[PDB]
Amino acid sequence: AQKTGILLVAFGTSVEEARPALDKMGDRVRAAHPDIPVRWAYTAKMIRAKLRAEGIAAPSPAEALAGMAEEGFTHVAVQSLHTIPGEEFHGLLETAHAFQGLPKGLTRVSVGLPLIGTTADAEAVAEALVASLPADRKPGEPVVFMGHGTPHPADICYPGLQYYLWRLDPDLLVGTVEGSPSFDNVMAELDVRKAKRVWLMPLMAVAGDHARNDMAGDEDDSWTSQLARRGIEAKPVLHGTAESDAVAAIWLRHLDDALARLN
Amino acid sequence: AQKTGILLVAFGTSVEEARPALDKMGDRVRAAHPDIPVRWAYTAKMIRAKLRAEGIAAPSPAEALAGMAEEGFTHVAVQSLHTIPGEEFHGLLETAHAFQGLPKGLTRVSVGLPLIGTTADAEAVAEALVASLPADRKPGEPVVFMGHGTPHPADICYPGLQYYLWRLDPDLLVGTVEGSPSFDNVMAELDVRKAKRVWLMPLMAVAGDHARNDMAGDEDDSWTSQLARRGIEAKPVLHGTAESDAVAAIWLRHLDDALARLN
Amino acid sequence: AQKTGILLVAFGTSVEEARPALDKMGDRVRAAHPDIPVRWAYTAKMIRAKLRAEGIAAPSPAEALAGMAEEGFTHVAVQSLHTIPGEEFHGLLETAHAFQGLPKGLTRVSVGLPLIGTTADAEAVAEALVASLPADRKPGEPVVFMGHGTPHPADICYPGLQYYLWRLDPDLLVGTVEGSPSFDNVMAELDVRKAKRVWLMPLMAVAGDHARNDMAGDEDDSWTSQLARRGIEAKPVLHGTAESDAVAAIWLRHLDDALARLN
Amino acid sequence: AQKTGILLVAFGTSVEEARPALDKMGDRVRAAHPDIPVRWAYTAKMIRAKLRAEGIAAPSPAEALAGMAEEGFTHVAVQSLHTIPGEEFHGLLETAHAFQGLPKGLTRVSVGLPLIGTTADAEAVAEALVASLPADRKPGEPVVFMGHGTPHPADICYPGLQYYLWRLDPDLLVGTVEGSPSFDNVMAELDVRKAKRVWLMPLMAVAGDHARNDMAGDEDDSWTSQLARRGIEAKPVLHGTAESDAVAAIWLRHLDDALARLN
Ligand code: HEM
Ligand code: HEM
Ligand SMILES: [O-][O-]
Ligand SMILES: [O-][O-]
Ligand SMILES: [O-][O-]
Ligand SMILES: [O-][O-]
Ligand SMILES: [Cl-]
Ligand SMILES: [Cl-]
Ligand SMILES: [Cl-]
Ligand SMILES: [Cl-]
Ligand SMILES: [Co+2]
Ligand SMILES: [Co+2]
Ligand SMILES: [Co+2]
Ligand SMILES: [Co+2]
Ligand code: NA
Ligand code: NA
Ligand code: NA
Ligand code: NA
Incomplete structure (x- = not known):
């Protein structure tokens, strides 16, 4: 049947x-x-x-x-x-x-x-993210990938992924709206690198409301607004x-x- | 909530x-x-x-x-x-x-x-069935209640119910389309009682296709057709x-x- | 493996x-x-x-x-x-x-x-019980099979079984310690039959404490004691x-x- | 009760x-x-x-x-x-x-x-590991923590933990017997740091057979044996x-x- x-x-x-x-x-x-x-x-x-x-x-x-x-x-x-x-x-x-x-x-x-299933997926994701970067991003310019974040234990996938990304490029960073690493953690990473232009890319499947509002919104507490206040040219990418x-x-x-x- | x-x-x-x-x-x-x-x-x-x-x-x-x-x-x-x-x-x-x-x-x-949940339900069902009988049914006239029947072990509820009904009236009988007691068992009960008029009532919640076709149908293998061939006035009740x-x-x-x- | x-x-x-x-x-x-x-x-x-x-x-x-x-x-x-x-x-x-x-x-x-699984098991149990009767039991002498009884819905198996036993012998009776039929139900069955000698057999796998005490005990409320008070020769069988x-x-x-x- | x-x-x-x-x-x-x-x-x-x-x-x-x-x-x-x-x-x-x-x-x-339950546990573990280090370990001397490793997705906890440890000390490293990071990954970390003395500590609750044999064994493929062949003073700690x-x-x-x- x-x-x-x-x-x-x-x-x-x-x-x-x-x-x-x-x-x-x-x-x-x-x-x-x-x-x-x-x-x-x-x-x-x-x-x-x-x-x-x-x-x-x-x-x-x-x-x-x-x-x-x-x-x-x-x-x-x-x-x-x-x-x-x-x-x-x-x-x-x-x-x-x-x-x-x-x-x-x-x-x-x-x-x-x-x-992000196995550690082998996590390494494959890191590589795929790198391949997905906009052609206009220059070497040396940091990229912040924005994940959701969760109180669930699987939150550990974000710092796990950061490990894999760094093995490829010291300037690729992971941040989350609700977990760890936090956006404050990302800004402290940006300060030590004295970066002038920073790319922001959603880590989620679709560029939804967190991407349009929390990452790239016009309001003061958005990621791009916070970066502009510290003199950084923020380049959000809504894909x-x-x-x-x-x-x-x-x-x-x-x-x-x-x-x-x-x- | x-x-x-x-x-x-x-x-x-x-x-x-x-x-x-x-x-x-x-x-x-x-x-x-x-x-x-x-x-x-x-x-x-x-x-x-x-x-x-x-x-x-x-x-x-x-x-x-x-x-x-x-x-x-x-x-x-x-x-x-x-x-x-x-x-x-x-x-x-x-x-x-x-x-x-x-x-x-x-x-x-x-x-x-x-x-038919507990033995206390089974006894209450027997009483309710008796109360449901048509007013024109006469004392002494057998009533056959038609249940579905199943190969599942809960089939034992039909002979269980027959026990309770008999405690009330020796002429109330249980038969099923697919289990035990069978319609043949019911006809053997009818023969020893030499009954001339027999009532048929569905045991299921609704008088569905088994009631309209298997119990009271026009075709030869229906219960009423089989009773008519042996000279019994069958009175089917479609409720x-x-x-x-x-x-x-x-x-x-x-x-x-x-x-x-x-x- | x-x-x-x-x-x-x-x-x-x-x-x-x-x-x-x-x-x-x-x-x-x-x-x-x-x-x-x-x-x-x-x-x-x-x-x-x-x-x-x-x-x-x-x-x-x-x-x-x-x-x-x-x-x-x-x-x-x-x-x-x-x-x-x-x-x-x-x-x-x-x-x-x-x-x-x-x-x-x-x-x-x-x-x-x-x-007692299916209705086909129930009929096979009835036949097996008949085959198990003591050789000294005489035709006409009632036999009471003692089951446990339960408030669970599967209690309906006892009256179901009684149906099957009666198809074989009108004098084979089912009683239970805790369910239906009750011992009082069995005594009312015995009174209409005016039986002078009654056999009692456990329905459970082993003749345990209910068999030795409730069915055949020396105390007043045992089945054999209650039958003796009404002038019945009780023959308990502890198997x-x-x-x-x-x-x-x-x-x-x-x-x-x-x-x-x-x- | x-x-x-x-x-x-x-x-x-x-x-x-x-x-x-x-x-x-x-x-x-x-x-x-x-x-x-x-x-x-x-x-x-x-x-x-x-x-x-x-x-x-x-x-x-x-x-x-x-x-x-x-x-x-x-x-x-x-x-x-x-x-x-x-x-x-x-x-x-x-x-x-x-x-x-x-x-x-x-x-x-x-x-x-x-x-390693939540990301908050992971950060607390990193701190506890640091507090657990032997008093004789000198600043600058790398410490390799040995985890089991697994093909299960929770393997991502090891690179997650490495993230947290590095936030505390760039010379604390995570390696695993069967997952990621691998021991080869750890040796490549050691080579860029040109470390002469390296501490090894089990990440598991008990210093079991992986600790005594794979991390600190006498045989050639043990971690300490492999480090000795490359001129590193290995200091295994069996706790x-x-x-x-x-x-x-x-x-x-x-x-x-x-x-x-x-x-
Ligand atoms: C006359 C025979 C049977 C009767 C009267 C019966 C009846 C019931 C009833 C009334 C319940 C409600 C649950 C409760 O009391 O908490 C129940 C539960 C359940 N029944 Fe049945 N059943 C019968 C045979 C079977 C068989 C043959 C199976 C498996 C092949 C089965 C499997 C289950 C299971 C899995 C549950 C839920 C959890 C549990 O086992 O209690 N039953 N059954
Ligand atoms: C890093 C990856 C994973 C982590 C960190 C993780 C962790 C956990 C934790 C901490 C719980 C406790 C239950 C609760 O929070 O209520 C749980 C429950 C559970 N997990 Fe996992 N797990 C992972 C991957 C998986 C996978 C791959 C499966 C299946 C193949 C799985 C299947 C389940 C199931 C069936 C439960 C119980 C009910 C439920 O689904 O919530 N987990 N998991
Ligand atoms: O989370 O909104
Ligand atoms: O059963 O149709
Ligand atoms: O039931 O004892
Ligand atoms: O894993 O041994
Ligand atoms: Cl430029
Ligand atoms: Cl008339
Ligand atoms: Cl005699
Ligand atoms: Cl020294
Ligand atoms: Co959200
Ligand atoms: Co049907
Ligand atoms: Co008991
Ligand atoms: Co192992
Ligand atoms: Na995400
Ligand atoms: Na039915
Ligand atoms: Na029993
Ligand atoms: Na471990």
Whole structure:
């Protein structure tokens, strides 16, 4: 009776200018698995709420998998587009396990690792980030990658990643909105380097509200505003990591592993 | 943040003439719990399929509970309108347990017992069945109650119930379409009683397709057709047990117990 | 790495005169599966406590399965010698599921049905009980089988069984210490039959404390004492059903099904 | 009926010279919770096997918790003395969850975080490691901390920790036997620093076989042997991190959090 499906799961975005990076990921998946149905879900409640408000279907992972059981899928590979295996990724794993083996439902539900899975992923991410840098960035000019940050233990992925980036370039820095390293830590790194021009790039899949507001906003407490007050030319780049082929390739490999775990 | 909901779950029916017994149960629940939201789900895949085909929303228990988590419910009392704790009732229990405690989802999901829960329910069902008999049934005229039957061990509820019915009336008989006692067992009971007029009543919540076709159909292998060939005046009664107040009261008590199990 | 084991689980007994029926079951299992290791566990806490007090190892199902994981077993078939799928049997099922698939532990843990599993088992039990009757019991003399009884819904197995027994012999009766039918129900059955000699047989695997005390005790409230006060010659028979080959054969078949469910 | 217990879980050691660090942890726990029973278990199969071979009881976490359920404990706080939340720590979490809520068993089983739990733990570990250094280590002399390493994603804790250590001292280095950073990575760090005297300290709770053999062994492929071949005075220090009060204090705090999670 066998039927295989793929569930792509993003934190998500509700802003029109940011959704293209999701669609680009959808194409990549379709191109690599032309005969497997692909469905979407979103882990953030507030974003499902805004998307429904605009008249767009936006299922939670639970709704998506109940709907997929209803369409007769038996084996589903779930791939998050999270960066780290934090709270949301763990919740997604609990949700997948809960659906597998329910009566008359899904036989097998596998979950692909987020971006920074193994130490080998972390080193591959560092390389992909380097390959993603804007052509106009000059050698010596620091780049701050902005991650979300979390109180979850997987926060340790950000300082782990900083290790790998430095092995490539002493001027590539990691900062987070809510964890460690903090933006203050990043500014202290910038002061010792006496950098005059600094690039800012989101570490998340899509350049969402943290990217547009906390990293590059007009208000005083944004990263670019804070850098301007200390005389630094801030160059924010509003592209999520899902726009990079070299980064996306790592999510794709994770999806391949999850499909293979279905048998 | 607390919010309590009730999920009523029927095997279900897709035939217009049979759905009124479901609506009657919905009223009873509303009348007994005027301030608790009440939602519906259906355990039979083929029936969800026919209802969707007619343009009617018919969620599986999984879809229903994912939707309810999405509306912000935290504590849900699930009540099946199954007759016995067989395969479908067990699947419903697995499905409820799977949803409870998922991240950002339902805190507590309780499940009410089907009709024949304890031996005290079984005795109460026997009494309610007796109270439900048509006024025109005469003393001495046998009544055959038709249950579904199952290969599941809960099939033992049918012969258990027969025990309780006989304590009340030697001429009340239990038969099933797919289990034990069989219709052949019932006919052998009828032969020793030399009964000339026999009543047939569904044991299920709604007088569905088994009631209209297997019990009372025009075709040769229906119960009434088989009784007519042996010279018995068959009186089929097309009312599910959900139409009886005395029977419905037992499902209601089960729902009260399940609400109390939420705290 | 594969290694298959069998876990036999009894409610248990702590009285020397009753343990032989367990040993007889152990032989039967060894004889039918000569190359599979067989281990024991007991569901009753008070009995594990008395056996430890006498210096006898008596593991709970949890201790047994943790020990078996430790010896390198990978696939274990658990067979209860319970009569009905009540509270204890359900707890055993939860305990088996909990062990299967734990890291570096058991791959597969299956559970065999108790005696009264399907309606087909129930009919086979009725036949086996009849075959087990003492040769001196005369036709027409009632036999009361004593079951435990439980508030669990599986109590419905006792009146279910009574149905099957009556199909064979109108004078075979089922009574229970704690459920339905009650001993009062049995005495009302005896009064209408005006029986002068009545046989009492335990329905449980071993003739334990309920058999020696509640059924056949010297005190006033025992079954035999109550029957003597109403002028009935009570003939108690202190053999658990595990002593009968015809009954044991049903547990053995259940164990075969559970072994096959391992693959 | 309430009864609270503490389960201390070590990877473990089977070598006499190394077990004192476990006993020191046992005292610390007893001293901080004088009225709570404390039990031991070990996650490594090969070590349970060697300890049983020497006649010492060495239960797996499953055996321990089944035994504790048997003694009447209801609420158990499990604390691993693992360094990272890798494969073994995850297995321990699965095992604890499996025991909680089993019939007549443990009501609540909580699990304390391993050493490197949050980014705040990671920074506290870095500080504790610094405080643990031998008094004879001179400023400027590098120290290599040896961790296990794992293919599990929690391997990212080692490069995460390296980040925190460097914030304190550019000459503190992290290396692992089986993950990243590798010993080759550490030697390349040593070459750029042209270090003549290097200290080696185990990162694990006990200075076990990896410490005595892979880090400080006489054979050619040991860390100290490899450093001697390149003209470096290697100073191995055979004390597990459990010997340090400043490090142990972090495990103790984790145990406090796990006790509080019992209510
Ligand atoms: C007449 C036979 C059976 C009856 C009357 C019955 C009834 C029930 C009921 C009423 C519950 C509610 C849970 C509770 O009391 O806490 C339950 C739970 C459950 N049942 Fe059944 N059941 C039967 C046979 C089985 C069988 C054959 C299986 C497995 C093959 C099974 C598996 C379970 C499981 C896994 C649960 C939830 C946790 C637990 O084991 O208590 N039951 N059952
Ligand atoms: C750096 C990577 C990882 C870290 C730091 C980590 C850490 C943790 C921690 C600290 C917990 C405690 C539970 C809680 O917070 O409530 C946890 C729970 C859990 N973890 Fe991990 N983990 C990682 C990767 C993984 C992976 C790859 C898997 C699966 C393959 C996994 C599976 C689980 C599961 C099933 C639980 C229990 C329920 C849940 O999903 O929250 N973790 N993990
Ligand atoms: O986090 O907003
Ligand atoms: O059963 O149709
Ligand atoms: O039940 O004793
Ligand atoms: O790892 O030995
Ligand atoms: Cl310039
Ligand atoms: Cl007439
Ligand atoms: Cl005589
Ligand atoms: Cl010197
Ligand atoms: Co945020
Ligand atoms: Co049917
Ligand atoms: Co008892
Ligand atoms: Co090792
Ligand atoms: Na991020
Ligand atoms: Na029925
Ligand atoms: Na019994
Ligand atoms: Na380590």
